[PDB]
Design a protein around this motif. Structure first.
Motif, PDB file in Angstrom:
ATOM      1  N   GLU A   1      -6.657   9.205  -4.641  1.00  0.00           N
ATOM      2  CA  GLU A   1      -6.926   8.007  -3.860  1.00  0.00           C
ATOM      3  C   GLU A   1      -5.637   7.264  -3.489  1.00  0.00           C
ATOM      4  OE1 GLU A   1     -10.899   5.796  -4.440  1.00  0.00           O
ATOM      5  OE2 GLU A   1     -10.342   6.533  -6.469  1.00  0.00           O
ATOM      6  N   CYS A   2      -4.646   7.249  -4.381  1.00  0.00           N
ATOM      7  CA  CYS A   2      -3.359   6.646  -4.037  1.00  0.00           C
ATOM      8  C   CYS A   2      -2.676   7.364  -2.874  1.00  0.00           C
ATOM      9  CB  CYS A   2      -2.425   6.620  -5.243  1.00  0.00           C
ATOM     10  SG  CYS A   2      -3.020   5.577  -6.619  1.00  0.00           S
TER      11      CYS A   2
ATOM     12  N   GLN B   1       0.830  -1.189   0.000  1.00  0.00           N
ATOM     13  CA  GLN B   1       0.000   0.000   0.000  1.00  0.00           C
ATOM     14  C   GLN B   1       0.876   1.256   0.000  1.00  0.00           C
ATOM     15  OE1 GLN B   1      -2.339  -1.810  -1.305  1.00  0.00           O
ATOM     16  NE2 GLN B   1      -3.640  -0.055  -0.721  1.00  0.00           N
TER      17      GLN B   1
ATOM     18  N   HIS C   1      -4.115   8.612  -0.185  1.00  0.00           N
ATOM     19  CA  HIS C   1      -4.923   8.577   1.019  1.00  0.00           C
ATOM     20  C   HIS C   1      -4.020   8.372   2.223  1.00  0.00           C
ATOM     21  CE1 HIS C   1      -8.541   8.054   3.393  1.00  0.00           C
ATOM     22  NE2 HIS C   1      -9.254   8.252   2.297  1.00  0.00           N
TER      23      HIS C   1
ATOM     24  N   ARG D   1      -6.461   3.420   0.149  1.00  0.00           N
ATOM     25  CA  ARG D   1      -5.824   3.572  -1.158  1.00  0.00           C
ATOM     26  C   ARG D   1      -6.253   2.386  -1.986  1.00  0.00           C
ATOM     27  NH1 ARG D   1      -0.142   4.078   1.788  1.00  0.00           N
ATOM     28  NH2 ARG D   1      -0.590   5.974   3.033  1.00  0.00           N
TER      29      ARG D   1
ATOM     30  N   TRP E   1       0.973   4.351  -2.885  1.00  0.00           N
ATOM     31  CA  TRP E   1       1.264   5.775  -2.734  1.00  0.00           C
ATOM     32  C   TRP E   1       2.302   6.234  -3.766  1.00  0.00           C
ATOM     33  CZ3 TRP E   1      -0.192   9.646   1.098  1.00  0.00           C
ATOM     34  CH2 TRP E   1       0.520  10.840   0.996  1.00  0.00           C
TER      35      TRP E   1
END
Ligand SMILES: *CCC(=O)Nc1ccc(CN(C(=O)Nc2c(Cl)c(OC)cc(OC)c2Cl)c2cc(Nc3ccc(N4CCN(C)CC4)cc3)ncn2)cc1
Length: 273
Positions: free
Chosen positions: A247-248, A192, A250, A256, A196
């Protein structure tokens, strides 16, 4: 440095799945500026048809740690498996000569330079850009499925082949502006947190090789990101793709998208075109 100075021969184990005939290989001229060792372009036969490959070897004043690092990278590339959108191991020469690591060559350099060189005053249309992003996402999804966390995903680490295929490179098998807050703060690296970085890569793509967070000193970034700062929409970017980027980025890793979702979302945009 004992092993290299002391051993007249280096007794690495023969691994027949990967060992490659030294006389089917022809070494050419340096590839890149060797920030990551001595890397050379070469031609390789019968992978009776020749094909262009890249070859990494020890610099002629390598330390034992240089030897261990090359061997480590080698072994890691063996386990990862083949995918079209990553730089694959093609072979090794370990028996009875210098250590050579043979891998895929990407003739057109990294993705950041590729984009910057083709900036308008077209060639980098919306479909081409989405296609770049899509390919990388497929590469990352594959890596994820093999339980590999990249930790340094960026356009400078994506290579472009002669046929404009994206191939993720990884110079860390043995920067801050691309790190998820949890990685900046606690050195927590996850799939995750790669997501990002993919978001930052996405921004890199649509600013045609732009530098992230312009005018912001690296020391200030963490408080900035904590206080909720995020990069704005690039001119060459539909609100919907910007939505993906955001969204990436988040704060909560669970909110994400996954790389599977990123692949499917980018695939749909491609069809639509
Ligand atoms: C510090 C600047 C610099 O020297 N960058 C740079 C990037 C890439 C390379 C060479 N390649 C490479 O290292 N591949 C590689 C290797 Cl050897 C290993 O070995 C363990 C592992 C992995 O990943 C698992 C990878 Cl990717 C490399 C290069 C290319 N093609 C290519 C051609 C030209 C350029 N280029 C030209 C000019 N500039 C300014 C920058 C870059 C980059 C890449 N294909 C495949 N591998 C060397 C240096």
């Amino acid at each position: 440095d004992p092993l290299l100075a002391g051993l007249v021969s280096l007794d690495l184990p023969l691994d027949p799945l990967w060992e490659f005939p030294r006389d089917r290989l022809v070494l050419g001229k340096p590839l890149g500026e060797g920030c990551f060792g001595q890397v050379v372009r070469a031609e390789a036969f019968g992978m009776d048809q020749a094909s262009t490959v890249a070859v990494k070897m020890l610099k002629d004043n390598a330390s034992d740690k240089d030897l261990a690092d090359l061997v480590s990278e080698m072994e890691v590339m063996k386990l990862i498996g083949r995918h079209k959108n990553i730089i694959n191991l093609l072979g090794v020469c370990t028996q009875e000569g210098p250590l050579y690591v043979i891998l895929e060559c990407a003739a057109k350099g990294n993705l950041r330079e590729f984009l910057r060189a083709r900036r308008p005053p077209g060639p980098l249309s919306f479909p081409v850009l989405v296609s770049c992003a899509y390919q990388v996402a497929r590469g990352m999804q594959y890596l994820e499925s093999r339980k590999c966390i990249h930790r340094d995903l960026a356009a400078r680490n994506v290579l472009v082949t002669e046929d404009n295929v994206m191939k993720i490179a990884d110079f860390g098998l043995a920067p801050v502006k691309w790190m998820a807050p949890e990685a900046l703060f606690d050195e927590v690296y996850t799939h995750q947190s790669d997501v990002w970085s993919f978001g930052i890569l996405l921004w890199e793509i649509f600013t045609l090789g732009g530098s992230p967070y312009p005018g912001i000193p690296v020391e200030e970034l963490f408080s900035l990101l904590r206080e909720g700062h995020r990069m704005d929409r690039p001119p060459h970017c539909p609100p919907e793709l910007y939505g993906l980027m955001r969204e990436c980025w988040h704060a909560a890793p669970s909110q994400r998208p996954t790389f599977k979702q990123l692949v499917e979302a980018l695939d749909k945009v491609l069809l639509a075109v």
